[PDB]
Amino acid sequence: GSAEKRKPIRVLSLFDGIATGLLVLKDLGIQVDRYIASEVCEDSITVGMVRHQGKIMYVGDVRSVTQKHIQEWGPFDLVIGGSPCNDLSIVNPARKGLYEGTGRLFFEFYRLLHDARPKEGDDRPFFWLFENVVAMGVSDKRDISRFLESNPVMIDAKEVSAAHRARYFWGNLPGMNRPLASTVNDKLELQECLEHGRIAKFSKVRTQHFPVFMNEKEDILWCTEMERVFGFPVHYTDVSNMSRLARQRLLGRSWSVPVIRHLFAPLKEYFACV
Amino acid sequence: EKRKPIRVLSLFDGIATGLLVLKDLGIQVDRYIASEVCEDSIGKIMYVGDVRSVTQKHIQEWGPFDLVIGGSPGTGRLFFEFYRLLHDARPKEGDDRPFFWLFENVVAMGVSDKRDISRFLESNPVMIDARYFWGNLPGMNRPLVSNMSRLARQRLLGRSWSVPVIRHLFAPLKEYFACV
Amino acid sequence: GSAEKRKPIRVLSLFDGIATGLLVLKDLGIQVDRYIASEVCEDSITVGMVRHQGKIMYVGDVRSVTQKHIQEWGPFDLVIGGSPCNDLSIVNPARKGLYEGTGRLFFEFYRLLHDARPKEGDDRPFFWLFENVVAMGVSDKRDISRFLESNPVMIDAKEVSAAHRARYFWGNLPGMNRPLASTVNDKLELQECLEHGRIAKFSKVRTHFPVFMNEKEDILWCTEMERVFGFPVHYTDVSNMSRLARQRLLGRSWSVPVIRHLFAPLKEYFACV
Amino acid sequence: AEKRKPIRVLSLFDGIATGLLVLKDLGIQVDRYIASEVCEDSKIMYVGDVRSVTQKHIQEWGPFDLVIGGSPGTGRLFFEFYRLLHDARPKEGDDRPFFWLFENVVAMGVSDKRDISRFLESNPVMIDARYFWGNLPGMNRPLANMSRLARQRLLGRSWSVPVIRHLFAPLKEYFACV
Ligand SMILES: Nc1ncnc2c1ncn2[C@@H]1O[C@H](CSCC[C@H](N)C(=O)O)[C@@H](O)[C@H]1O
Numbered sequence: 001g002s003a004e005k006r007k008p009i010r011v012l013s014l015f016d017g018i019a020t021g022l023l024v025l026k027d028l029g030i031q032v033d034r035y036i037a038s039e040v041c042e043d044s045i046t047v048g049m050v051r052h053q054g055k056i057m058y059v060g061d062v063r064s065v066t067q068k069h070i071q072e073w074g075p076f077d078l079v080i081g082g083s084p085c086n087d088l089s090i091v092n093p094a095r096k097g098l099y100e101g102t103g104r105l106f107f108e109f110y111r112l113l114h115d116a117r118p119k120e121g122d123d124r125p126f127f128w129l130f131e132n133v134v135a136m137g138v139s140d141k142r143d144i145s146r147f148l149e150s151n152p153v154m155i156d157a158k159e160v161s162a163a164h165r166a167r168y169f170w171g172n173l174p175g176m177n178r179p180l181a182s183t184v185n186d187k188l189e190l191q192e193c194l195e196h197g198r199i200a201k202f203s204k205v206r207t208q209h210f211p212v213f214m215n216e217k218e219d220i221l222w223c224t225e226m227e228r229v230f231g232f233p234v235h236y237t238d239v240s241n242m243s244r245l246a247r248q249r250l251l252g253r254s255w256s257v258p259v260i261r262h263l264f265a266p267l268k269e270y271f272a273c274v
Numbered sequence: 275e276k277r278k279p280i281r282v283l284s285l286f287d288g289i290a291t292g293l294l295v296l297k298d299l300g301i302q303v304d305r306y307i308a309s310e311v312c313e314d315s316i317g318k319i320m321y322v323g324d325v326r327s328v329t330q331k332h333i334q335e336w337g338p339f340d341l342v343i344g345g346s347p348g349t350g351r352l353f354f355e356f357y358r359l360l361h362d363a364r365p366k367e368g369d370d371r372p373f374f375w376l377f378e379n380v381v382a383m384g385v386s387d388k389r390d391i392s393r394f395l396e397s398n399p400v401m402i403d404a405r406y407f408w409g410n411l412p413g414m415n416r417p418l419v420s421n422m423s424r425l426a427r428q429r430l431l432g433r434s435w436s437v438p439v440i441r442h443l444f445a446p447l448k449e450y451f452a453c454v
Numbered sequence: 455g456s457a458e459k460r461k462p463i464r465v466l467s468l469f470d471g472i473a474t475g476l477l478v479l480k481d482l483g484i485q486v487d488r489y490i491a492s493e494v495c496e497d498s499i500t501v502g503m504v505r506h507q508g509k510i511m512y513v514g515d516v517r518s519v520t521q522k523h524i525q526e527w528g529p530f531d532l533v534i535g536g537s538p539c540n541d542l543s544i545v546n547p548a549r550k551g552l553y554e555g556t557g558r559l560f561f562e563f564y565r566l567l568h569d570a571r572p573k574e575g576d577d578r579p580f581f582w583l584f585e586n587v588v589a590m591g592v593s594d595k596r597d598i599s600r601f602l603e604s605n606p607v608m609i610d611a612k613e614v615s616a617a618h619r620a621r622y623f624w625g626n627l628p629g630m631n632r633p634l635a636s637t638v639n640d641k642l643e644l645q646e647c648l649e650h651g652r653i654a655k656f657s658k659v660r661t662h663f664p665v666f667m668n669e670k671e672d673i674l675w676c677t678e679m680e681r682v683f684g685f686p687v688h689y690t691d692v693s694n695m696s697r698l699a700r701q702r703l704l705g706r707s708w709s710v711p712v713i714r715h716l717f718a719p720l721k722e723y724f725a726c727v
Numbered sequence: 728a729e730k731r732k733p734i735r736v737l738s739l740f741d742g743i744a745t746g747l748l749v750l751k752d753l754g755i756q757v758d759r760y761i762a763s764e765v766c767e768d769s770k771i772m773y774v775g776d777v778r779s780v781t782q783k784h785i786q787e788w789g790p791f792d793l794v795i796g797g798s799p800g801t802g803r804l805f806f807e808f809y810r811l812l813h814d815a816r817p818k819e820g821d822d823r824p825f826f827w828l829f830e831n832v833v834a835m836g837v838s839d840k841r842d843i844s845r846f847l848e849s850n851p852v853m854i855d856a857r858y859f860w861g862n863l864p865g866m867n868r869p870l871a872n873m874s875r876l877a878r879q880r881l882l883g884r885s886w887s888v889p890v891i892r893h894l895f896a897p898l899k900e901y902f903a904c905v
């Protein structure tokens with residue numbers, strides 16, 4: 001209810017990956033004051049460094065971050081995160097659940113988020129977002145919704161991209177449950193994402209079939225095609241001499257860019273826009 | 275500005291243990307609410323059931339709380355519930371009122387779990403030969419037809435296994451809360 | 455001496471690799487009527503197919519190409535080629551020479567070129583080019599110059615790029631020996647070719663660890679190597695290839711500014727966009 | 728189109744004047760016989776190393792009617808022979824007779840055999856053993872206080888048997904005979 005110049009957003013991104021959040025914020029025209037990211041995979045760190053010109057401040061393991069660190073590096077306006085899910089997904093029979101293995105990393109989020117929320121009486125806008133997979137134990141989803149005091153929103157990237165990617169999103173971002181908008185930049189069909197000389201079998205691709213035909217033979221998706229599918233700029237992940245398995249793994253763990261765009265869009269009215 | 279009876283929140287295995295130690299040390303109790311993990315399925319003293327039913331608003335209403343205890347003499351599930359209850363019961367920034375907590379577990383745990391608990395609680399444990407005891411209590415600062423009323427009900431029940439030597443850890447509470 | 459409308463160039467590229475010739479011809483604004491390429495590496499074929507929208511007519515092994523094929527697919531205006539040099543380079547001690555191993559592939563060129571030369575009395579412009587390495591046996595170089603009836607021109611890509619790549623070029627292209635032009639697009643220094651957050655140790659790469667990133671040492675990335683050799687960034691980013699495959703394809707490739715320098719005079723002989 | 732004239736031969740075959748001897752055996756008039764030989768390093772003539780022979784030399788000494796090469800690594804020999812053949816071949820539109828023959832040993836890499844058959848566009852003639860490629864009528868094959876002292880040995884041994892001569896027999900139906 002007061003007057004002031006809208007200021008650039010301050011972001012804390014845990015489990016940053018290939019810095020999808022910063023890319024989405026840049027694409028929206030939102031000015032980023034600073035972007036502190038916690039990531040351990042060196043390949044993802046190299047991707048972020050090269051593609052965002054070192055603007056990202058890397059702090060390493062999320063478990064090396066203390067509350068004193070959150071207050072000194074802070075304040076923060078937006079806290080985003082997507083913890084690893086190899087111990088949360090039901091497709092893994094050796095899953096250790098939300099509380100053991102790599103699932104317990106989620107609590108780190110719940111830790112730092114509570115270390116980052118404005119103290120009582122601070123009416124400043126503060127937003128947070130936590131993404132994970134839909135294919136998890138109902139006990140684990142109920143426990144996450146208990147710890148975050150919010151119910152998740154289910155968004156499938158197939159509605160805005162060419163990939164069957166349904167994900168749960170907890171958070172307090174404005175209008176998370178609002179209908180997604182299919183714009184013109186959205187490549188809804190897999191054929192739109194393929195390189196020249198290839199033909200797509202299905203309309204959408206899933207994370208035993210090889211989806212593309214090339215000449216007289218069958219083939220899996222290329223990394224550039226996978227980038228177009230997930231909404232990333234072409235050759236986004238073309239750094240660091242990493243193996244093809246490395247690029248495919250990095251893109252597999254990544255968020256769908258149009259989905260995160262849909263989620264981050266309402267932030268344009270709360271911060272400075274270039 | 276004057277001593278008042280203690281208010282406790284217990285996630286420990288066995289609702290009795292904490293209140294028993296408190297009555298042993300002779301500390302007045304104005305509120306004691308207990309809950310269990312119950313991971314399988316779903317005036318002063320009260321039992322509230324599954325911890326999965328206890329919300330932040332419940333801690334607010336039942337509160338304020340002065341002591342928060344947890345643990346047991348699957349090691350990750352109960353500690354994180356205890357951490358959530360601690361965060362929900364902590365006094366807000368700017369409330370210098372006393373607030374203590376204690377978490378007991380077995381020494382036979384994964385070293386990863388021990389390091390994680392020490393990190394999350396910002397405190398190093400107390401070894402008692404053997405159990406680990408984390409806490410902010412003074413002294414726990416550590417460096418690095420026509421028959422019986424009873425009838426069977428088909429359940430196993432726990433007990434209070436800790437001796438008054440473990441209550442010696444709680445002993446400093448007598449200097450912070452009213453004693454009868 | 456007569457009048458006619460300039461027509462698009464017809465090209466025959468043997469040992470095409472990654473269509474360095476087609477890319478150079480497109481960059482120069484020269485209209486390409488037809489581009490028939492002979493290449494056997496499937497990775498290179500995929501690169502050339504994807505990057506040029508299937509404009510390339512791939513005929514496979516150069517040894518499955520006959521003289522009747524040159525007449526029926528012809529006429530051709532330009533014939534370019536760069537045979538493999540693993541049996542020509544003095545670095546390899548197990549080299550088999552020009553006449554054995556993979557060196558004899560050169561003769562295939564010498565074959566098809568003579569199968570594509572305009573017959574006597576045909577005053578039409580016809581150009582050819584054959585590239586290979588400088589580090590070869592003096593006898594093999596003398597033999598190649600004897601077979602092609604031309605002395606080679608030595609061009610080192612270090613003069614217009616950031617790579618110590620000196621090569622021999624035989625051919626009849628106009629003014630091959632003319633001085634090269636260092637333009638503004640030329641990234642002469644290895645630093646200009648690096649991705650963000652890396653520092654170059656040497657001014658030009660000779661392919662130890664050429665770059666320093668943060669506190670560690672590292673070799674050149676594929677995009678950096680593309681910038682070094684004059685290729686557009688992410689040119690070779692198709693086909694789920696292994697990193698070794700990308701480094702191998704870029705190693706065997708021509709330096710783009712050098713081929714541009716060689717092909718530039720062709721603008722006054724054919725139709726230009 | 729006109730009366731027969733003597734034959735003119737260009738010989739790179741290992742062993743000099745072997746073809747001259749065979750032509751003398753078959754009684755064919757020879758108006759020119761130029762002979763050369765491949766070397767490791769530096770009206771009937773021997774012109775030395777084939778590396779010194781150019782297209783202009785083939786034009787001056789020419790025209791040629793027969794081109795012979797081979798030996799009773801194999802690549803260098805055949806490829807020098809191919810260069811000489813290409814330089815001596817009549818241009819398109821010249822229907823004048825022009826024959827060639829290339830002999831090698833059967834003991835060769837099968838890759839080399841197929842490469843020679845491809846380059847010469849001809850399948851070989853096996854003779855109990857040597858391989859003979861040629862365009863002579865009959866070789867068409869389907870798909871399979873004394874003077875001498877102190878010098879580096881110059882043994883001119885070369886096999887010119889009647890069967891080998893037989894291959895050259897059709898030549899007497901195209902050129903003048905003494
Ligand atoms: N202990 C830890 N601290 C910080 N990051 C971690 C971590 N353990 C795993 N990670 C990283 O967290 C990532 C989760 S996958 C999510 C990545 C991100 N949401 C994106 O869209 O790119 C993984 O890439 C993994 O490298």
Ligand SMILES: Nc1ncnc2c1ncn2[C@@H]1O[C@H](CSCC[C@H](N)C(=O)O)[C@@H](O)[C@H]1O
Pocket residue numbers: 468469470471472473474492493494495498514515516517535536537538559706707708
């Ligand atoms: N027998 C053959 N027929 C056709 N191409 C061949 C071949 N043997 C090898 N090659 C190809 O010839 C290439 C020679 S390296 C030269 C590549 C090209 N000049 C460029 O600039 O990209 C190699 O990539 C190899 O794949």
